Structure 1
């Protein structure tokens, strides 16, 4: 426990969970909606995927 010739700095990164609040002003984005689609695929021996 002798002090060496040189000194040192120690750096670390820390994570903090945080519950945030988001405000949005009215009419800030225009959205265009499309018609939904349904297709089928992966026809396999016992099942179908949609």
Structure 2
């Protein structure tokens, strides 16, 4: 039961089977961006509000 399996593990006994663990670390990195000379377009407009 889920009740019995609560009651076996805190004591500590292997309950017939096992598990697997899936988790998520996260890493801030400093990347590097090479570019070719003429790639983008990026036009410009007008300024008023």
The structure with the largest helix share of the pair is 2
Per the TM superposition, whether the score is higher than 0.5 is yes
Structure 2 gap ranges (5+): 1-11
Segments of 5+ residues of structure 1 without an aligned counterpart are: 40-50
Given the two structures, how large is their TM-score scaled by the length of structure 1?
0.63
4+ runs deviating over 3 angstroms:
none
Number of residues paired by the alignment? 38
TM-score w.r.t. length of structure 2 = 0.64
